[PDB]
Structure 1
């Protein structure tokens, strides 16, 4: 293990504060009332409820999201027995992983006890604190006895992940492989190396899944484990003892075998006995920190070999992080009393089915141009796939539903999946009304920049959600080749339409219409033809204008203002308005907030500010929020008389003249706008209540600087912008640094805008 890596690990664990976890409150503790409610005499009130009903304990405490990771330091991942105090950082890291990947609060516990019975007594005593138990690093064979006793005795789910999770992943992998090579589960022959508990659980699951016991072979360091080899051998080991046939060595039984499993040590297998078994071997190496064999050797000696390792640098890694947080999430969200094998089967099926679907953006970006399509080189999902929780947790919850172990049944699964998604993507809670409205009637959207990888990913995700009917512009060859490269599943002509800009049958009409529009703006006919050949944005705008589409989303490459100029020239302002603006959404501690204007006007006057305010209010109303506007300046309610403050005052009077029912006030400082108490101290009778959610700035300088600084400082770094208002058709212009999720959000928003007859 590298000395520099060791130094990096020590410095990471040390600075700037020792440890890796921290306990924080989730409530305000500022005033005296917070103290009164969070402690005596307030804290007594919920307590009585728990006395009347234990189930209500799942309703006022963290018990419904608390998991214990208990260890004794006897079976650390690669160090054997070193003491629990030595093993504490491992459990801290496990808890960090829990919180990161499933939003589950954990307590790590080291119990200095070696007697299994006293261990059981302690764990059973600690029951009311937690809602679930996960064991870790307990050596065999004590682990089986402890787990069985606790599962029988305790009333909450218990795992030993090293005994179960690896079994889940291996079962899913081998089932998928048998799907690949088209071999029936009945006639496959099983060969097992090592006596690690993962192997035993694997045979248990496979037998419960359909594998036949007469085709299995279990081999320890003593060779073939046949009946009568020794009388005082373990009963668990005896359960897989076969009728003796004279074979003693692993070489005798490996020939003609279908699947090889190993969790004992490196170099046990060799390329000759790799030649020994049947067609399409199933190499499965789980030994750490080195595998049984080198996958290059197995692949060079046999091409169709399938190899799975426990190391990240090799394809098809079996990492336990794929399972445990999600099974615990599913179990806890229904209050299952215990986790049976039904849940494990459901998890295996979920992993297998997820292995078939299309690749996500994160993993595709992370793992480069590797041939990551379904098949021998890609058989199980990567650890960082975000769809894992959404595909696993509802399945485990339904398995709990069927077996009757649930105690708090869920009504319908749709809101559950929605909540999980809001955990995953951090903007679903904000965008849910938009998605719900858009899904009722999809429209046609043009993405002129149809060769970018981000646009292709967004198109795939839009088709999957059934949220729009995309139209792409570009050369079909490049688009198809990149679709193959990224391993997507959308098919041209079935899920979306491709418009070949270099050669289209409607070129004549398009450039004729463009010239008819722009002849008085200094555009000759040759310029019109050249533009309709070379500029995708013009093609998209013309397509939208003629009614062959319904919305356009552009601007993910190049400058903002060229796209905006083209759009404004083609479409023009909507009736009753003489200006356009851009507005960015943001998530501050005080809630969602919109900022305008950030992109269009460099120095708006009072009239433009009034029109921008009205359009912003309408757009916010679309989100199902009650608009609350604030005009910002360095002047604080007339404390200065620079021209900007006067412009704000005139804009405010204009807005109050036009829309009398809108909640608006100003001009004020930012803190007064965002904080109720500060505003009430200086202006007790203001017409603005609560915290404002629309902020109007005097110039694009202030808007852009504030937006960027808040975007970075509000530690999320996510937005919904720039929404463009004032143009006569539902079009938006993005920025080159826009991510996939923002593109999807704007496509949904444009669809929603286009659903109604454009105003």
Structure 2
């Protein structure tokens, strides 16, 4: 793409150059605080590391630090573009390391092409880092460098491209073998191209039972023929195929149970897939193009199982699926290196994650074990809970574990807390929108941000945009922005001034509002000036299915329009406004940020129920907490008494819901603070839904936190309780916020109308 290619160039620059930053972890406010971080206090920690260098984890960041190193020789698929140009990728490793594994990571770019000299620099940096992740080092240098460094360095050395992708591919093979019911020793494996991971796949596969003679390796020149070259690379000589008269891939593909290979753009054809054995396993792992298109192989062989590196095709083999979770277990036991036994233990846990049953969505996915699901989702949360204990338990058995863990259950619980914090509810919602697009009206069609959103909604294919406004101003603005969206084709424009059904529309609005103080002469004025009214009428008739408005205008202008045309949903008598923020405590929400200035007891209860119902659908656990200036009966304020009555009310309508209150804000986010004021609290962990006692409390909180918590744009002001799928936005809402909200409306529009 070019639309998404440019939004990343902007992302890597705004607001600050660079993605990662070194921040303090200990205070430094006072003058004594400086005398303990430096002179003369810092003398003591250094003198305890010369006494005992094993005590380095206690006083330094070495106990959770890994260096991603690269010379830029083969960055992803770009090639040798330079070590300096490869820095944004190495920073990406660290930011993914921190987001998922919580492992502080330094990006290191070494300007050395000589394999020996490069090895010296890395061995020199051993005391600095607790672990070394070798990244984007072209072949065959990587085989030599990684081998020498693991022996040389008493800290773990790992190659994510060579060994990491092998752990995923090996796990897929073992799982796929269980589905086709073929024993590993019997299957014959054929590998295309001199894949760096291919050598490690076989090694791991051999350690599990795969016969070497069954393995047939095919370099890009041809099949490996023993003796065709007197001088041969050690990786090619180790897996040597005796010359059997087979020169091409089409010669060895017949009678082959498994196909694999990093190298090769589109080496597999539809005719070669027919020639393969029963229920073939196809592992296509070339970044630009799969070895065979997965539908092309399914058409000739329905029993086949295909694995690609690309995310659109199922069974994604992502490097991000393992390499952070391996280092996490290794760093927690202080392993001297990552032995093959640990890597294998990771392969087991990854396959075990597919077998284990799913738990607890608006997005529609099935995780049942089958030909579509032989490897877990690329961003599955349970990865850390399973991979890290297995790596550490194997490391303690192997004897490289310097530091033991007394109880694995305590360690798992720490890992369990980290899982709760991170969730990606947005991605399944988007995919659900592609399955059944619905028409959505945007009343502010002439606004610049709406136009940018209209394109990205048309590009991803989420909904049918129906803009409102003077077409003349829209057409001009499109050409000034550089967009390729076509009126009457990509999106339907409705002019507020010229409309055939105009008389039909004002008669419906008048029949609704004749008694709410709207004359006929006013209603006709209304369907030309306020586009919110126009779209609102369209949804009730069926001309559209949802509406996203409020990108320019006071919230209550648009909300009063909605409230009158569609009315409350069934079984509701008050509406709610829920905003979201990405907090250290995880994804968190605020209740009634715009609707009711002073919500009463029963009104506050209905808001809570709708927010819980709406969060359940997102794929997030509803852990609700009512907030007040009172702490569990500190004050008898009428606003604090109202919160208490609401807790009792919700308990009778949805007793299964987890909620407690009232409490201070800190008590709802830190489980420790809550355990000292209330041990019996039904609330467990960080709460994600915060119901406010009044709007001022809400709007002051959402604002002050949006700036100082994080810039995670997820869902803006989510309106709840209205019978028709509608959401009203803030005027300062960014373009990314507009897109996300339109998708949310489509999934709500797929629901029973």
Range class of TM-score, shorter chain: 0.5 to 0.7
Which range moves more in the overlay, 640-649 or 63-72? Answer: 640-649
Structure 1 residue ranges without an equivalent (≥5): none
Distance in 2 separating the partners of 1:192 and 1:406: 35
| Compared CA separation, residues 46 and 757, structure 1 to 2 (3 A) | farther
- Give deviations 1:669-690, integer Å, cap 9, x for gaps: 9999999999999999999999
Distance in 1 separating the partners of 2:438 and 2:271: 61
| Compared CA separation, residues 477 and 652, structure 1 to 2 (3 A) | same
* Structure 1 position 708, deviation (Å): 9.0
Contact 2:421-2:587 at 8 Å conserved across structures = no
Which range moves more in the overlay, 85-94 or 743-752? Answer: 743-752
* Structure 1 position 533, deviation (Å): 46
1:372-387 correspondence to structure 2 within 5 Å: 372-387=367-382
Distance in 1 separating the partners of 2:685 and 2:284: 60
- Give deviations 1:126-185, integer Å, cap 9, x for gaps: 110000001111111111111111111111000011010110000000110000111111
Which range moves more in the overlay, 128-137 or 707-716? Answer: 707-716
- Give deviations 1:111-140, integer Å, cap 9, x for gaps: 111111111111111110000001111111
* Structure 1 position 697, deviation (Å): 11
* Structure 1 position 581, deviation (Å): 19
Which range moves more in the overlay, 687-696 or 313-322? Answer: 687-696
| Compared CA separation, residues 652 and 327, structure 1 to 2 (3 A) | closer
* Structure 1 position 63, deviation (Å): 0.3
Contact 2:583-2:710 at 8 Å conserved across structures = no
* Structure 1 position 226, deviation (Å): 2.5
Distance in 2 separating the partners of 1:733 and 1:320: 40
- Give deviations 1:268-305, integer Å, cap 9, x for gaps: 11111111111111111101121111111111111111
Which range moves more in the overlay, 351-360 or 175-184? Answer: 351-360
- Give deviations 1:532-577, integer Å, cap 9, x for gaps: 9999999999999999999999999999999999999999999999
Contact 2:627-2:690 at 8 Å conserved across structures = yes
Contact 2:425-2:619 at 8 Å conserved across structures = no
| Compared CA separation, residues 30 and 508, structure 1 to 2 (3 A) | same
Contact 1:421-1:428 at 8 Å conserved across structures = no
* Structure 1 position 37, deviation (Å): 1.3
Verify: 1:336 aligned to 2:338, yes or no.
Answer: no
SS class of match (1:428)? coil
* Structure 1 position 197, deviation (Å): 1.3
Contact 2:266-2:289 at 8 Å conserved across structures = no
Distance in 2 separating the partners of 1:480 and 1:303: 48
Contact 2:434-2:461 at 8 Å conserved across structures = yes
| Compared CA separation, residues 485 and 195, structure 1 to 2 (3 A) | farther
| Compared CA separation, residues 523 and 403, structure 1 to 2 (3 A) | farther
* Structure 1 position 369, deviation (Å): 3.1
Contact 1:360-1:385 at 8 Å conserved across structures = no
RMSD between aligned alpha carbons?
13.7
Which range moves more in the overlay, 265-274 or 732-741? Answer: 732-741
* Structure 1 position 358, deviation (Å): 3.0
Distance in 2 separating the partners of 1:295 and 1:355: 21
| Compared CA separation, residues 277 and 473, structure 1 to 2 (3 A) | farther
* Structure 1 position 649, deviation (Å): 20
Q: Which residue of 2 aligns with 1:51?
A: 50
Verify: 1:645 aligned to 2:640, yes or no.
Answer: yes
Contact 2:455-2:483 at 8 Å conserved across structures = yes
Which range moves more in the overlay, 53-62 or 645-654? Answer: 645-654
* Structure 1 position 437, deviation (Å): 39
- Give deviations 1:312-369, integer Å, cap 9, x for gaps: 11100100000100000000000000111110110000000101223466xxxx9943
- Give deviations 1:1-38, integer Å, cap 9, x for gaps: x3333322211112221111111111222121211111
Contact 1:358-1:487 at 8 Å conserved across structures = no
Contact 2:154-2:336 at 8 Å conserved across structures = yes
Query: Which residue, out of 523, 529, 532, partners 1:537?
Result: 532
SS class of match (1:685)? coil
* Structure 1 position 65, deviation (Å): 0.6
SS class of match (1:621)? helix
Q: Which residue of 2 aligns with 1:675?
A: 670
Structure 2 residue ranges without an equivalent (≥5): none
- Give deviations 1:246-272, integer Å, cap 9, x for gaps: 222222211111001121121211111
SS class of match (2:701)? helix
Distance in 1 separating the partners of 2:261 and 2:173: 13
Contact 1:372-1:487 at 8 Å conserved across structures = no
SS class of match (1:84)? coil
| Compared CA separation, residues 688 and 36, structure 1 to 2 (3 A) | farther
Contact 1:550-1:730 at 8 Å conserved across structures = yes
| Compared CA separation, residues 44 and 469, structure 1 to 2 (3 A) | farther
* Structure 1 position 232, deviation (Å): 1.3
* Structure 1 position 655, deviation (Å): 27
Verify: 1:629 aligned to 2:630, yes or no.
Answer: no
Which range moves more in the overlay, 233-242 or 323-332? Answer: 233-242
* Structure 1 position 421, deviation (Å): 1.2
Contact 1:28-1:34 at 8 Å conserved across structures = yes
| Compared CA separation, residues 697 and 729, structure 1 to 2 (3 A) | same
* Structure 1 position 379, deviation (Å): 1.1
| Compared CA separation, residues 458 and 228, structure 1 to 2 (3 A) | same
* Structure 1 position 215, deviation (Å): 1.1
Q: Which residue of 2 aligns with 1:217?
A: 216
Contact 2:592-2:691 at 8 Å conserved across structures = yes
Distance in 2 separating the partners of 1:420 and 1:717: 23
- Give deviations 1:724-753, integer Å, cap 9, x for gaps: 999999999999999999999999999999
| Compared CA separation, residues 250 and 576, structure 1 to 2 (3 A) | closer
* Structure 1 position 57, deviation (Å): 1.1
SS class of match (2:213)? helix
| Compared CA separation, residues 115 and 452, structure 1 to 2 (3 A) | closer
Q: Which residue of 1 aligns with 2:733?
A: 738
- Give deviations 1:368-406, integer Å, cap 9, x for gaps: 435542200111111111100001100000000100100
| Compared CA separation, residues 467 and 299, structure 1 to 2 (3 A) | closer
| Compared CA separation, residues 148 and 449, structure 1 to 2 (3 A) | same
Contact 1:371-1:377 at 8 Å conserved across structures = no
Contact 1:373-1:487 at 8 Å conserved across structures = no
* Structure 1 position 235, deviation (Å): 2.2
| Compared CA separation, residues 382 and 503, structure 1 to 2 (3 A) | farther
Contact 2:713-2:736 at 8 Å conserved across structures = no
Q: Which residue of 1 aligns with 2:564?
A: 569
* Structure 1 position 719, deviation (Å): 17
* Structure 1 position 642, deviation (Å): 14
Distance in 2 separating the partners of 1:67 and 1:259: 35
Contact 1:584-1:719 at 8 Å conserved across structures = no
SS class of match (2:676)? helix
* Structure 1 position 234, deviation (Å): 1.5
Q: Which residue of 2 aligns with 1:204?
A: 203
* Structure 1 position 493, deviation (Å): 54
| Compared CA separation, residues 244 and 494, structure 1 to 2 (3 A) | same
Contact 2:285-2:309 at 8 Å conserved across structures = yes
Verify: 1:244 aligned to 2:243, yes or no.
Answer: yes
* Structure 1 position 110, deviation (Å): 0.7
Distance in 2 separating the partners of 1:539 and 1:414: 59
- Give deviations 1:601-660, integer Å, cap 9, x for gaps: 999999999999999999999999999999999999999999999999999999999999
SS class of match (1:429)? coil
| Compared CA separation, residues 536 and 330, structure 1 to 2 (3 A) | farther
Contact 1:711-1:719 at 8 Å conserved across structures = no
Distance in 2 separating the partners of 1:748 and 1:539: 21
Contact 2:425-2:620 at 8 Å conserved across structures = no
Contact 2:421-2:584 at 8 Å conserved across structures = no
SS class of match (1:68)? strand
| Compared CA separation, residues 547 and 24, structure 1 to 2 (3 A) | same
Distance in 1 separating the partners of 2:227 and 2:390: 43
Distance in 2 separating the partners of 1:97 and 1:430: 18
Contact 2:445-2:468 at 8 Å conserved across structures = yes
| Compared CA separation, residues 225 and 375, structure 1 to 2 (3 A) | same
Indicate the structure (1 or 2) with the bigger Cα radius of gyration: 1
| Compared CA separation, residues 542 and 103, structure 1 to 2 (3 A) | same
